[PDB]
Assembly symmetry: C2
Homo-oligomer: 364 residues x 2
């Protein structure tokens, strides 16, 4: 019976993964072991308790005995531990959320509705590192999967409207708190433009409104920089997109992906405006048809107001496995370009779900 170890389970991706596993009976045929850095040797509270004591995340001996380890811990942890394990002779499967290993020749990026047949080929060829892609790539590729499978996409501009969850649980707490504080200081009786001014000036004071995590106040704001600077002009968040998509599809012919990644005051759903150039001209009805058949999670939202405002939003989509996609229209830019807008949940299809699903492929 497979000994599977879990690192990262305490955080958001990790809880969402746990919850998705409980719901799917994914613990049934494995011997879980739960790793930690805090109450080690202690019995955790919750269901995890039935698997016994928490072992040490940094103990290399304990990690070594697992057949499969699954980390939502982060890149600082993967950089600091993964190499020690291979250096120390461990030949088990490393399933990881962090971006560190994404691009190594030994790694396979996992998004099984697009590259199942490749995950299998990798496991089969004695490959052992299976890494979740960046949330933007996962969520996009799933939305237009029915075009990508037919190799109909020449390139993709994406402009993202990214939620705070991708940044972790303290960033979200911060966002909620910024918004709380500003809501207190805001006075209904004051003139509307003066209120806006008052919030605006308050939002800038780092000693009143905590902004160390979001660097600046995110509430009533936008932040058009995610991650680290690249010499090309992109953030790291943005450069990911093209290379990962092509690694997932294992393209003969590179499909360029570009645009800008913007943090907005949403909580767990990433949204994206896509401008997609096709390899051939297609009617708009052919495009919807194909999109609608990409997988079972794609959820087409018809291009009208009532349905767009009700279903093509973070409000509507958060918590769910739906890849909503709408505003599907032809473009004035060129006869072969179309536009659409999509929304999906960062924590699930964006982080946790692909990991859970590849685990299942590895264990059976």
């Amino acid at each position: 019976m497979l000994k599977v170890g879990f690192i990262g389970w305490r955080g958001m991706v990790g809880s969402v993964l746990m919850s998705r596993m409980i719901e799917s009976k994914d613990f049934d045929c494995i011997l879980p072991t739960f790793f930690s850095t805090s109450q080690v040797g202690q019995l955790p509270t919750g269901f995890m308790q039935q698997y016994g004591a928490l072992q040490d995340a940094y103990s290399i001996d304990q990690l070594s005995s697992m057949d499969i380890l699954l980390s939502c811990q982060g890149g600082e942890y993967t950089k600091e531990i993964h190499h020690k394990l291979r250096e120390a002779g461990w030949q088990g499967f490393w399933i990881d959320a962090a971006s560190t290993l994404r691009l190594d020749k030994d790694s396979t990026l996992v998004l099984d509705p697009l590259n199942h047949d490749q995950i299998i080929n990798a496991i089969d060829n004695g490959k052992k590192d299976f890494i979740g892609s960046n949330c933007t790539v996962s969520l996009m590729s799933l939305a237009i999967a029915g075009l990508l499978k037919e190799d109909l996409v020449e390139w993709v501009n994406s402009s993202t409207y990214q939620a705070i969850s991708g940044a972790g649980a303290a960033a979200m707490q911060e966002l909620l708190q910024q918004t709380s504080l500003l809501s207190k200081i805001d006075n209904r009786d004051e003139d509307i433009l003066i209120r806006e001014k008052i919030l605006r000036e308050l939002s800038k004071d780092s000693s009143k409104i905590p902004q160390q995590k979001t660097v600046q106040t995110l509430a009533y704001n936008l932040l058009p920089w995610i991650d680290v600077g690249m010499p090309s002009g992109q953030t790291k968040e943005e450069y990911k997109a093209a290379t990962e998509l092509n690694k997932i599809l294992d393209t003969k012919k590179t499909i360029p992906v570009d645009g800008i990644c913007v943090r907005v005051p949403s909580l767990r759903s990433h949204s994206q405006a896509l401008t997609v150039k096709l390899r051939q001209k297609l009617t708009i009805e052919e495009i919807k048809q194909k999109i609608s058949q990409g997988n079972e999670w794609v959820k087409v939202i018809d291009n009208n107001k009532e349905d767009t405002l009700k279903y093509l939003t973070p409000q509507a989509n958060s918590g769910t496995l739906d890849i909503a996609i709408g505003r599907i229209k032809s473009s004035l830019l060129a006869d072969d370009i179309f536009h659409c807008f999509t929304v999906g949940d960062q924590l699930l299809w964006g982080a946790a779900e692909p990991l859970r699903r590849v685990l299942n492929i590895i264990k059976i």
Copy 2:
């Protein structure tokens, strides 16, 4: 002897921002203002308007007729009621308007004078009397990449907007502030983070707890990728406005397509825009910044690094100002001739009030 100028719309947001911009610029100096209203007529308004006398009636066709120039921030319902009655009643004065009603008539001239000043003058000169402010997205975009448009270097533009609630009016903004207030009250710090998100999320959907008629759905912790009326092309009216207005402002021989999506976000007064621009010629990224940086005095380039981007290329930074901030200027993987950038500017000023104020000045001269 002096120009008699009447003001409709002055109580609302665009209108206050206009008043403020006029005080600051001494734009009342050489005109006889008259302030029109639809409620407290005959009343002495409070504030500086006091010095120009009593409020006249917005709907009185006689009183309006005596003004040499009328300037409306009132709206399209009002322009619809009243503008035709004035022309029907013989009045040949200048109608400067914010509303979109008249934007595309052959008789109308769209105003954005850092780009089409020469044309405003030609229009006034040719006995044209209707001067209309363009949609905020067009005004703000065109100004940001003005230095490329003047050289006719732009083949097309994809814009994805992140539009603030102010463009929807003062009650919509109040609504947004209030949604956020109420949700903040129910939110509990001690509860588990994913449960809090859930609680807000479910509360946001109850129209009897969280008012959402003005924004149709809750905008707080949300976004709304539909602005305005459905078009048969697939666009919203907000989105179709872009291409036709830009081409009217530039009076192009060759249409420059503008497309993308317009999205409402929980900002208050600054519209942001991610632009993907295809050029007619390949240009280095330094040539592109250079040109952009010389489009006009308001264009403010923000160097493509984190500290500066987060501090200056944002609604927080930009709201209240005349700066057209533009940054994240980079070359693109899509094509050797495409570049990307992100811009931010204030909806109420360059987006609404400022162009109007400035064309008034061209007419009074």
